[PDB]
Amino acid sequence: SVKGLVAVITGGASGLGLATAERLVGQGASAVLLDLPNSGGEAQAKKLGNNCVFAPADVTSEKDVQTALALAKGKFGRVDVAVNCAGIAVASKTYNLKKGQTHTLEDFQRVLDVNLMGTFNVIRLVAGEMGQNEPDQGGQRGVIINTASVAAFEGQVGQAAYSASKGGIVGMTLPIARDLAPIGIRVMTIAPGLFGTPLLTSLPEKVCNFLASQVPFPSRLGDPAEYAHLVQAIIENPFLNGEVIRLDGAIRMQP
Amino acid sequence: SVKGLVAVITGGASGLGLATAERLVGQGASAVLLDLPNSGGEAQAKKLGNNCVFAPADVTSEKDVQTALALAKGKFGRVDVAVNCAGIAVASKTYNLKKGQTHTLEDFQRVLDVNLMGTFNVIRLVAGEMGQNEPDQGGQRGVIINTASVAAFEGQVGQAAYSASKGGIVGMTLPIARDLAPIGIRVMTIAPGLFGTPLLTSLPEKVCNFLASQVPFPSRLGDPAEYAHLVQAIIENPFLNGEVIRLDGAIRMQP
Amino acid sequence: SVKGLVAVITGGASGLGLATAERLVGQGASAVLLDLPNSGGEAQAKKLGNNCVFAPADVTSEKDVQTALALAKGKFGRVDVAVNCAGIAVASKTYNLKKGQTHTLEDFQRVLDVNLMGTFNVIRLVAGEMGQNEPDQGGQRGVIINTASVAAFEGQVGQAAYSASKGGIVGMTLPIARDLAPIGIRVMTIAPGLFGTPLLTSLPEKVCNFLASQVPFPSRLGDPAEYAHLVQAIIENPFLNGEVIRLDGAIRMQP
Amino acid sequence: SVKGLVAVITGGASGLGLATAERLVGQGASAVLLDLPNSGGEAQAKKLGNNCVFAPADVTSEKDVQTALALAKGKFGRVDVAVNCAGIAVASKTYNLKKGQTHTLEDFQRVLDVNLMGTFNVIRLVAGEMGQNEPDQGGQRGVIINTASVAAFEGQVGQAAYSASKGGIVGMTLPIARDLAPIGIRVMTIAPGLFGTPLLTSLPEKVCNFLASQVPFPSRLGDPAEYAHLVQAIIENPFLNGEVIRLDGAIRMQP
Amino acid sequence: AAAREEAKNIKLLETTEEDKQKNFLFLRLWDRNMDIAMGWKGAQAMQFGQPLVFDMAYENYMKRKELQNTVSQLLESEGWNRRNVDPFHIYFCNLKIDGALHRELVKRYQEKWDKLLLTSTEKSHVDLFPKDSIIYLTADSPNVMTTFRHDKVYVIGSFVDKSMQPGTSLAKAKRLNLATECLPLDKYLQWEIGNKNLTLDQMIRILLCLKNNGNWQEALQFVPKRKHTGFLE
Ligand SMILES: NC(=O)c1ccc[n+]([C@@H]2O[C@H](COP(=O)([O-])OP(=O)(O)OC[C@H]3O[C@@H](n4cnc5c(N)ncnc54)[C@H](O)[C@@H]3O)[C@@H](O)[C@H]2O)c1
Ligand SMILES: NC(=O)c1ccc[n+]([C@@H]2O[C@H](COP(=O)([O-])OP(=O)(O)OC[C@H]3O[C@@H](n4cnc5c(N)ncnc54)[C@H](O)[C@@H]3O)[C@@H](O)[C@H]2O)c1
Ligand SMILES: NC(=O)c1ccc[n+]([C@@H]2O[C@H](COP(=O)([O-])OP(=O)(O)OC[C@H]3O[C@@H](n4cnc5c(N)ncnc54)[C@H](O)[C@@H]3O)[C@@H](O)[C@H]2O)c1
Ligand SMILES: NC(=O)c1ccc[n+]([C@@H]2O[C@H](COP(=O)([O-])OP(=O)(O)OC[C@H]3O[C@@H](n4cnc5c(N)ncnc54)[C@H](O)[C@@H]3O)[C@@H](O)[C@H]2O)c1
Ligand SMILES: Nc1ncnc2c1ncn2[C@@H]1O[C@H](CSCC[C@H](N)C(=O)O)[C@@H](O)[C@H]1O
């Protein structure tokens, strides 16, 4: 069970973060949806009930995340789990010879800031918050679960910046786990494949059908409920640490 | 859930396989401990209850595995899950200039037979029985979980044959997942680290404490119950496929 | 043979970049040491000879890299190879509970900007520069080699930012190779281990000597000449693309 | 340079092994083509010159490899390099539900015996002779370069046994490197992609053409001269050890 | 084109911007990706797929117009095969290199011909597969197909005879002494008015539906509706 746990879910107003919040609150936990002010996260928080609260914050801003964690601590008294699901996607080729078009540096920089820098900002602040928790019978003060992508391993054409940020998350998973091992905080990463979230369901139906056919088995877009299930499995297993799990249905992206 | 599932657990009379069988049978599932005739699996199967039966088989023999699968079908009528936990360990340096001692081809071949050839034997034979299953909601007919090792990635001195077998398992995890995708069988691999099973206690007790300390967090040898928990999580999640999960507590093996 | 090639080597005034420039200019190629103005690159460029020039530039600035590439085109007329060796290191734990010390977002941002963002800036601008080349017999217009670290895989304590940046480089290596394949540009990454450069000799000699002793074979710090040799080998072999090569001497880092 | 070196090349009568032998002997080295008696090795040795000899041996047999190594020592006096390029491919699906066809255990065993068991046999036997070598100025007594495939990491349908053998080679690369580090022997692995050799004769011509077109860049089949060049580069770089190098032109295999 | 130009200027008048926030995971290169996926599947089928033969041995029984029709139906059949989740391994047997049919196929396919993932050969289906595994599909066979068999090689006559020549495919199959089967159309459909010989594309679609565990109703949904009146209950 995860009853009584407090989860800070960044990007918790939509998609994978929303599914994780729904599952965890359904099992009896308390959730803090840390999201952007104009993401409609207050409606989701109210829909989830009393055990869910909304924190309007930008993961790329230290002050916003600090205020969100202060709100979480005041409302629920502590933080046990952190789920970094905030992120943005951008498609852009590094260089197009035919069009003479070059990848803009702003796109790369903002993708980095939102994904990699935002994940690290949340991780460090929430690790500081967890360090105050009395270790349990197993000596654990908390769990941090980051959302990478399979683009961190076989990113496609136009995914240079996205792949850079997700590969950064993958590369920094183990060092942070080693850093926080003395503190008793487990650090894990989930690298989902193609999931039926607003980041993908907004595409034309033919594209969605093709993507579903591209998954070996099951030949469908991943359900966010499956991501939530894997997150809960990581939370409950005390021996999963410093590892990246590919929740992608055995797909390997084509160029 | 796992209520009503039938699991064939190779090497299920001791260690990780026994823990998996205990967890699954304790949750309303049925277990077939496929183990060697002299492994003392009859006592384990009797202790577990009626939902557990013992099949004396050698995973390296086609006839024995076929007989065990026939017994499983006769007793329960189905095979939903397969868990390859049968394996042996050999410690021997490839060469020793100081001693002039060379690895014997027999040791390498025995390790490969039990660990890599037996695993593929069981997989290929149980895909036949899981292929007779009527696909359920989602098109899945079964799940196959394999036990690799972190030695497939970071192998230590005098561990070349074990590393070869586990690396073969890791390498063939994805091709087999691509083979059985049309059938609807998910193929997963677990790469456990250091676990408190009879395999490790054979080492000197002084070394047990050192190995426990060598784990970043938790600083202890893994509990087989955690392996069973990860196995159940893989069974429950319908989107994990063709992936290797390191259940090692962030440990990295040194030379 | 690399005679006649033009290599833009970032961070070419010291360490691995200087070793690469020395090796390549010795063969007969022309080099452009793209480095910070107050770095001593002028002396190195004068020492190397008439085929080496110094470009005072910051890899994190678009204008500076544009000026450096304009200087390279004005001097040598074209660019054939681009070796990204610019980078910085920071040692800082993500969080220290005993000291109550938290990693500063400034350090993480700075390391990301230099190691990761600057690498992509140089990659995109030099890909634009190399698209003007007439393809050779094999249809190749240029080669881009980037420097990563084994921290991308085996990150140590207080290496979260460095590991994040190097993992970002590793993740972006393949997407960029897929992007630039139609142009005819190969993208490769070298993940060195420990080398005897100014980035390491700064650290206390005791810990550096301990790390050097822990390299399986050769039990020493890597020689930058070896890095330059691998760079030349990558340049020569036309079939190496989208791959990371660990030039670490078989060392896997410990926490 | 590589002048005066003695290289034992397994499977050196055809394809990658023959290309490696040609390159090394042309560079001034000595070669022993360790191959099957009916493989046409003697004609290749005659065509290469007086610095190359043919050893009729089966890598799956200890006695044959011992005789080949004795012949190599008699002719040249020492062994410095060992290139394991002997292997076979099998195209068989694990299980075919529609056809009711099951992978034959004999095919899996044969592929494992040749690709994986034979490689380790050669490695362990040749380490004994390379241990008698006087250590170099850097302490190096010799180099062993194994051949793997990208199937070890991404194996397609009907490649379970081949993937298992190549993954076993990949997994055992590092343990053997650690084992032989004390005696100054470097162990490296090359994972080629698609090369034009008699190995691919089995596939239909159109399948080979499509696969070649699916290489990002260069969009063609690998030239064995490139494999030989990479082998020589590994021979000449004293700091490459324990690593796997993907020589595949950035291709990634799909189901 | 003119309507699209004027409407394009009209759509330019909006200038609303803020389109998806530029939060895109993939570039719009979907046709290329679909083609590449179909190519990978075709390679897998060429290696492990079930054989299906079109025997191009009727050039002497067909006029020019019938030859053009046969080529068009062959293209449609091949296209339908490529898209399938489990494609056949298509063989073009008895295809003379310099014959009229091969010439038209090459003209129609251009450079794609050498890249089509199928086996084209001058040899007959009896020189490539055991005579026992070959089932030659004809509308005049005494036997009636009951179930699709996955270990059998089905042979379809690439023949379009708008001038009726009954028994030609049956006669050809009889010279080689091959087993013959006919699609069940009297059993499942009230035939009404029409011709009992379907086109190549319809045949391949029916066979593909059957190979994917489809029933006879779903498989025979590809029979033109104008011919029959309903599926017999
Ligand atoms: N959707 C996929 O198929 C897929 C696949 C692999 C990885 N991912 C990653 O999984 C994560 C889950 O996102 P999703 O798929 O649900 O898409 P999503 O857009 O539905 O979820 C992203 C969430 O992050 C929030 N957010 C964005 N920027 C923020 C910021 N600066 N501060 C705070 N909150 C911010 C958004 O408001 C939203 O709630 C993302 O990081 C995504 O890149 C998604
Ligand atoms: N013990 C660890 O910490 C650890 C770590 C990593 C991997 N592993 C792997 O996990 C698996 C679990 O082993 P364990 O730790 O429980 O040790 P164990 O010895 O308790 O379990 C091994 C089991 O395999 C059975 N077995 C061996 N050969 C067999 C054969 N031919 N036919 C049938 N059964 C056979 C044995 O009887 C025994 O029941 C093994 O494959 C092991 O290599 C273990
Ligand atoms: N030293 C090692 O063993 C090791 C190991 C793994 C990776 N690396 C990476 O190798 C690369 C080479 O470092 P090194 O060992 O030669 O140390 P170094 O300090 O000599 O190399 C860094 C060089 O980059 C230049 N540089 C830094 N920031 C710059 C900027 N913004 N614009 C332009 N030039 C800039 C510096 O002036 C210097 O010349 C670094 O990227 C490092 O992270 C080093
Ligand atoms: N061909 C490719 O594109 C490709 C790709 C990846 C890996 N590989 C590996 O590269 C190696 C070279 O194969 P190749 O492409 O040159 O094909 P090949 O058939 O020309 O090479 C195989 C060689 O091994 C020899 N051989 C086979 N069994 C032997 C045995 N038992 N004892 C001694 N010699 C034996 C054969 O006589 C032959 O000379 C193989 O191990 C193959 O698996 C090849
Ligand atoms: N009802 C049916 N049963 C079996 N095969 C059929 C069929 N209708 C069409 N076909 C197949 O489609 C091909 C094109 S129809 C041409 C029919 C011509 N009378 C002949 O001699 O074959 C036929 O050759 C046969 O292979």
Short mmCIF file of N, CA, C and O in Angstrom, two decimals, chain A residues 88-91 93 110 156 159 194 200 202 206-207 210 214 254-255, chain E residues 20-27 29-30 32-34 36-38 40:
data_model
loop_
_atom_site.label_atom_id
_atom_site.label_comp_id
_atom_site.label_asym_id
_atom_site.label_seq_id
_atom_site.Cartn_x
_atom_site.Cartn_y
_atom_site.Cartn_z
N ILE A 88 8.66 19.34 -21.73
CA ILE A 88 8.16 19.79 -23.02
C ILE A 88 8.92 19.05 -24.11
O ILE A 88 10.06 18.62 -23.92
N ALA A 89 8.27 18.90 -25.26
CA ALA A 89 8.87 18.27 -26.42
C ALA A 89 9.04 19.31 -27.52
O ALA A 89 8.22 20.22 -27.65
N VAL A 90 10.10 19.17 -28.30
CA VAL A 90 10.36 20.05 -29.44
C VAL A 90 10.99 19.22 -30.54
O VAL A 90 11.93 18.45 -30.29
N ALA A 91 10.49 19.37 -31.76
CA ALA A 91 11.02 18.69 -32.93
C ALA A 91 11.67 19.72 -33.83
O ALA A 91 11.03 20.70 -34.23
N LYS A 93 15.24 19.78 -36.76
CA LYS A 93 16.47 19.19 -37.27
C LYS A 93 17.67 20.04 -36.89
O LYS A 93 17.59 21.27 -36.79
N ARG A 110 15.74 26.12 -24.09
CA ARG A 110 14.51 26.06 -23.33
C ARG A 110 14.10 24.61 -23.06
O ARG A 110 13.57 24.30 -21.98
N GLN A 156 15.11 10.05 -32.59
CA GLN A 156 14.90 10.08 -34.03
C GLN A 156 15.35 11.41 -34.62
O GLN A 156 15.94 12.26 -33.94
N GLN A 159 14.90 15.17 -32.91
CA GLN A 159 14.80 15.03 -31.46
C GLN A 159 16.13 15.32 -30.76
O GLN A 159 16.38 14.81 -29.67
N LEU A 194 5.75 5.28 -26.22
CA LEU A 194 4.67 6.06 -26.82
C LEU A 194 3.41 5.84 -25.99
O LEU A 194 2.87 4.73 -25.97
N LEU A 200 0.47 13.28 -27.44
CA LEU A 200 0.37 12.43 -28.62
C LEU A 200 -1.04 12.30 -29.17
O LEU A 200 -1.20 12.18 -30.38
N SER A 202 -3.15 14.48 -29.62
CA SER A 202 -3.49 15.64 -30.43
C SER A 202 -3.12 15.47 -31.90
O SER A 202 -3.48 16.33 -32.71
N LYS A 206 -4.61 9.06 -38.25
CA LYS A 206 -3.75 8.16 -39.03
C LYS A 206 -2.38 8.02 -38.38
O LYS A 206 -1.82 6.92 -38.31
N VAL A 207 -1.82 9.14 -37.90
CA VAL A 207 -0.53 9.09 -37.23
C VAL A 207 -0.62 8.25 -35.97
O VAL A 207 0.29 7.46 -35.67
N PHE A 210 -0.62 4.62 -36.94
CA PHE A 210 0.72 4.18 -37.32
C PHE A 210 1.59 3.95 -36.09
O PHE A 210 2.28 2.94 -35.98
N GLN A 214 3.35 0.56 -34.62
CA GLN A 214 4.80 0.47 -34.48
C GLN A 214 5.23 -0.21 -33.19
O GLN A 214 6.38 -0.65 -33.09
N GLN A 254 12.52 4.20 -35.15
CA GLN A 254 13.21 4.32 -36.42
C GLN A 254 13.81 5.71 -36.57
O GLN A 254 13.43 6.64 -35.86
N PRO A 255 14.76 5.88 -37.50
CA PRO A 255 15.36 7.21 -37.72
C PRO A 255 14.32 8.29 -37.98
O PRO A 255 13.16 8.01 -38.28
N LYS E 20 -0.02 25.34 -31.05
CA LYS E 20 0.44 24.16 -30.31
C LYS E 20 1.58 24.48 -29.35
O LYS E 20 2.15 23.57 -28.74
N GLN E 21 1.92 25.76 -29.18
CA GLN E 21 3.06 26.19 -28.38
C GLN E 21 4.39 25.70 -28.94
O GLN E 21 5.42 25.82 -28.28
N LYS E 22 4.38 25.15 -30.16
CA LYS E 22 5.55 24.49 -30.74
C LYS E 22 6.00 23.32 -29.88
O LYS E 22 7.19 22.99 -29.83
N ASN E 23 5.06 22.67 -29.20
CA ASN E 23 5.34 21.52 -28.35
C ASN E 23 5.06 20.25 -29.15
O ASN E 23 4.05 19.57 -28.96
N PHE E 24 5.97 19.94 -30.07
CA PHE E 24 5.83 18.82 -30.98
C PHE E 24 6.88 17.77 -30.66
O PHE E 24 8.06 18.10 -30.48
N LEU E 25 6.46 16.51 -30.58
CA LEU E 25 7.38 15.41 -30.31
C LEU E 25 8.02 14.86 -31.57
O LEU E 25 9.16 14.37 -31.51
N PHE E 26 7.34 14.94 -32.71
CA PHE E 26 7.85 14.41 -33.97
C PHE E 26 7.67 15.45 -35.07
O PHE E 26 6.74 16.25 -35.04
N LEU E 27 8.58 15.41 -36.04
CA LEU E 27 8.39 16.15 -37.27
C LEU E 27 7.36 15.44 -38.14
O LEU E 27 7.10 14.24 -37.99
N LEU E 29 6.92 13.71 -40.91
CA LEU E 29 7.58 12.87 -41.91
C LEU E 29 6.94 11.49 -41.91
O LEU E 29 7.61 10.46 -41.94
N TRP E 30 5.60 11.46 -41.89
CA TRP E 30 4.88 10.23 -41.60
C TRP E 30 4.85 9.28 -42.79
O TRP E 30 4.90 8.06 -42.61
N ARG E 32 7.20 8.88 -45.03
CA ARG E 32 8.51 8.24 -45.06
C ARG E 32 8.60 7.13 -44.02
O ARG E 32 9.09 6.03 -44.29
N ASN E 33 8.12 7.41 -42.80
CA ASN E 33 8.18 6.41 -41.74
C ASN E 33 7.31 5.21 -42.07
O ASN E 33 7.69 4.07 -41.79
N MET E 34 6.13 5.44 -42.64
CA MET E 34 5.27 4.34 -43.03
C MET E 34 5.93 3.48 -44.10
O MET E 34 5.88 2.25 -44.04
N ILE E 36 9.16 3.12 -44.58
CA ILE E 36 10.28 2.40 -43.99
C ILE E 36 9.79 1.22 -43.15
O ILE E 36 10.38 0.13 -43.18
N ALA E 37 8.71 1.42 -42.39
CA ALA E 37 8.15 0.32 -41.62
C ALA E 37 7.64 -0.79 -42.54
O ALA E 37 7.85 -1.98 -42.26
N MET E 38 6.98 -0.42 -43.63
CA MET E 38 6.53 -1.43 -44.59
C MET E 38 7.72 -2.17 -45.19
O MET E 38 7.64 -3.38 -45.44
N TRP E 40 10.68 -2.75 -43.70
CA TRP E 40 11.17 -3.69 -42.69
C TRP E 40 10.26 -4.91 -42.60
O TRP E 40 10.74 -6.05 -42.53
#
